[PDB]
C-alpha cells in the first residue's frame, strides 16, 4: 500500500503545515500538523474543555461506528514552546492520503494550552518520530507510520514541504519526479527517539564550506533552523544591522536587508537554503525589524533542522530495520 497527501502552510510565513486526515466511520476529516519530532496522534475532540476550543474541527468518537475507548489509557505531552495537551485514548480507523490503518490510537484532548486554542487552523498533531516517545500510559502506543509500515510497499515516508506553497507527504514510496539529482542517505540514531543525524558542515552565502559535525534532528513540527551559537553568529554577521534581541527572543534583522543563503552538508552533498526562506517577517505588524529563520539552539539542548531547512530539500524518512535519512535538492 501507499498514501499521498498534500500539506498546506497555515499562514503566509509557513509557521506550520496542515495535512487532512480521515478519522472514524463515517470519516471525520481533521487538519493535523505532521510532526517528525513527536510520537502522539492527538486531536481536538468532543471531550476538549469547551473554553479551550476556538474554531478547530473536533473529532467526536461517539459518531464513529469504529471508535473504541482504550480503557484506562491517558496521555500528556509538552512541546519545546511550552504548549501542552492531555486526555484519554480511543482506537479508530485513520487514513492519510488513501493509506488506512485500523486500530490506530487516537489521543482525544481533554485539555490543551493557550497557543493551541489560539490557532484555529491546527486540529491536532500526527507524530512521526519513533514510538518510544509516545506518551500513552500505561500501555505505550504506536505511531501511524509504525502501524502502517508492514502494509507499505517500502518502509518509508517522505516530506516535500513547500516555500509559501503546498507540498506533499508520501507513505510507502519515493516519488523520483519530486527531486533533482540523487538522494544522499545518512545514518540515524534512534537513542533519543528522534530522526537524529549528523550534518557534515555549513556555508554562509557564497562563503567557503566549514567541515564540522553538527548533530541534530529532522523535525517537521519545528518552524525554524536551530543551530549552535557559533554557526548562527557566523550567519547573522553577514547581515548588516542583525543582532540577537533578548526582548524579542532571538536574532532580528532590518526588513530592508537581503539575506544570504545558508548551506548545510549531508555527507558529501549540500542543501542550499535560499535567503528568502530565512525571512519570517516583521516582529510585530508594521515593524521594520524582521525575525530570523536561523536561531541559536543554546538552551534547547539539541540542534533542530526544522522547516526552514527541510523545505529546501526532498527528505526521505527510511524506517527500515536500520533507519536512515535521505536528502535531495529539488
Ligand atoms: C504554537 N504552540 C502549539 C504547537 C503547534 C504546533 C506544534 O507542532 C507544536 C505546538
Q: Is the domain of 12 the same as that of 84?
A: yes
Cell (9 digits) for 35 = 510532526
Q: Is 35 part of the annotated catalytic residue set?
A: yes
- Rounded to whole angstroms, the Cα distance separating 194 from 219 reads 8
Task: State the distance from the centre of ligand 1 to the C-alpha of 69, rounded, in angstroms.
Answer: 26
Q: Find out whether 83 and 116 touch, Cβ atoms under 8 Å.
A: yes
Q: Is the domain of 143 the same as that of 184?
A: no
Strand-pair partners of 101: 94
Alpha carbon of 178 to those of 2, 52, 305: distances in Å?
A: 16, 39, 20
Q: Measured at the alpha carbon of residue 136, what is the angle toward residues 324 and 300, in degrees to the nearest 5?
A: 55
CATH number, position 73: 2.40.70.10
Cis, bond preceding 138 (omega within 30 deg of 0): yes
- b/e for 3-20, b at 16 or more Cβ within 10 A? bbbebbbbeeebbbbbbb
Q: Is the domain of 64 the same as that of 208?
A: no
Q: Is the domain of 275 the same as that of 291?
A: yes
- Rounded to whole angstroms, the Cα distance separating 102 from 92 reads 6
Q: Is the domain of 290 the same as that of 237?
A: yes
Q: Find out whether 101 and 150 touch, Cβ atoms under 8 Å.
A: no
- Rounded to whole angstroms, the Cα distance separating 87 from 94 reads 19
Torsion of CA 309, 312, 314, 315, to 10 degrees: 0
Q: Find out whether 291 and 250 touch, Cβ atoms under 8 Å.
A: yes
122 Cβ below 6 A of ligand 1: yes
- b/e for 282-307, b at 16 or more Cβ within 10 A? ebeeeeebbbbbbbbbeeeeebbbbb
- Rounded to whole angstroms, the Cα distance separating 17 from 14 reads 7
Q: Find out whether 117 and 123 touch, Cβ atoms under 8 Å.
A: no
- Rounded to whole angstroms, the Cα distance separating 289 from 300 reads 24
Of 114, 143, 174, which residue constitutes the final position of a domain? 174
Alpha helices in the chain (DSSP H): 114-117, 144-148, 229-236, 307-310
> Probe ligand 1: pick from 56, 119, 124, 306, max atoms within 8 Å of CB?
119
Q: Find out whether 280 and 291 touch, Cβ atoms under 8 Å.
A: yes
Element of type H or E holding 3: strand 3-9
114 Cβ below 6 A of ligand 1: no
Q: Is 287 part of the annotated catalytic residue set?
A: no
Task: State the distance from the centre of ligand 1 to the C-alpha of 16, rounded, in angstroms.
Answer: 8
Task: State the distance from the centre of ligand 1 to the C-alpha of 269, rounded, in angstroms.
Answer: 31
Q: Find out whether 153 and 137 touch, Cβ atoms under 8 Å.
A: no
Cell (9 digits) for 147 = 502501524
Q: Is the domain of 57 the same as that of 164?
A: yes
Cell (9 digits) for 211 = 567541515
Cell (9 digits) for 49 = 474543555
Computed over its alpha carbons, how large is the radius of gyration of the chain?
20
Structure determined by:
X-ray
Q: Is the domain of 181 the same as that of 105?
A: no
Q: Is the domain of 24 the same as that of 149?
A: yes
By residue range, what is the domain housing residue 230?
175-330
3-state secondary structure of 291: strand
Amino acid at each position: 500500500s501507499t498514501g499521498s497527501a498534500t500539506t498546506t502552510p497555515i499562514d503566509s510565513l509557513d509557521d506550520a503545515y496542515i495535512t487532512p486526515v480521515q478519522i472514524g466511520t463515517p470519516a471525520q476529516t481533521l487538519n493535523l500538523d505532521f510532526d517528525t519530532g513527536s510520537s502522539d496522534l492527538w486531536v481536538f475532540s468532543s471531550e476538549t474543555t469547551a473554553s479551550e476550543v476556538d474554531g478547530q474541527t473536533i473529532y467526536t468518537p461517539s459518531k464513529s461506528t469504529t471508535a473504541k475507548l482504550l480503557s484506562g489509557a491517558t496521555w500528556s505531552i509538552s512541546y519545546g514552546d511550552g504548549s501542552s495537551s492531555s486526555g484519554d485514548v480511543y482506537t479508530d480507523t485513520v487514513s492519510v492520503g488513501g493509506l488506512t490503518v485500523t486500530g490506530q490510537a487516537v489521543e482525544s484532548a481533554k485539555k490543551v494550552s493557550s497557543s493551541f486554542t489560539e490557532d484555529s487552523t491546527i486540529d491536532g498533531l500526527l507524530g512521526l518520530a519513533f514510538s518510544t516517545l509516545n506518551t500513552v500510559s500505561p500501555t505505550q502506543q504506536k505511531t501511524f507510520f509504525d502501524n502502517a509500515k508492514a502494509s507499505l510497499d517500502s518502509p518509508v515516508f517522505t516530506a516535500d514541504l513547500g516555500y509559501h506553497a503546498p507540498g506533499t507527504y508520501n507513505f510507502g514510496f519515493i516519488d523520483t519526479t519530486a527531486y533533482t539529482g540523487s538522494i544522499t542517505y545518512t545514518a540515524v540514531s534512534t537513542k533519543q527517539g528522534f530522526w537524529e543525524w549528523t550534518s557534515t558542515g555549513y556555508a554562509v552565502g557564497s562563503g567557503t564550506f566549514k567541515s564540522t559535525s553538527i548533530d541534530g534532528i529532522a523535525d517537521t513540527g519545528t518552524t525554524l533552523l536551530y543551530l549552535p551559537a557559533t554557526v548562527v553568529s557566523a550567519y547573522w554577521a553577514q547581515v548588516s544591522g542583525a543582532k540577537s534581541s533578548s526582548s524579542v527572543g532571538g536574532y532580528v534583522f532590518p526588513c530592508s536587508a537581503t539575506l544570504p543563503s545558508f548551506t548545510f552538508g549531508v555527507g558529501s552533498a549540500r542543501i542550499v537554503i535560499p535567503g528568502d526562506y530565512i525571512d519570517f517577517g516583521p516582529i510585530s505588524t508594521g515593524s521594520s525589524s524582521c525575525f530570523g529563520g536561523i536561531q541559536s539552539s543554546a538552551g534547547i539542548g539539541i540542534n533542530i533542522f526544522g522547516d526552514v531547512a527541510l523545505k529546501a530539500a526532498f527528505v526521505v524518512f527510511n524506517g527500515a530495520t536500520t533507519p536512515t535519512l535521505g536528502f535531495a535538492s529539488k
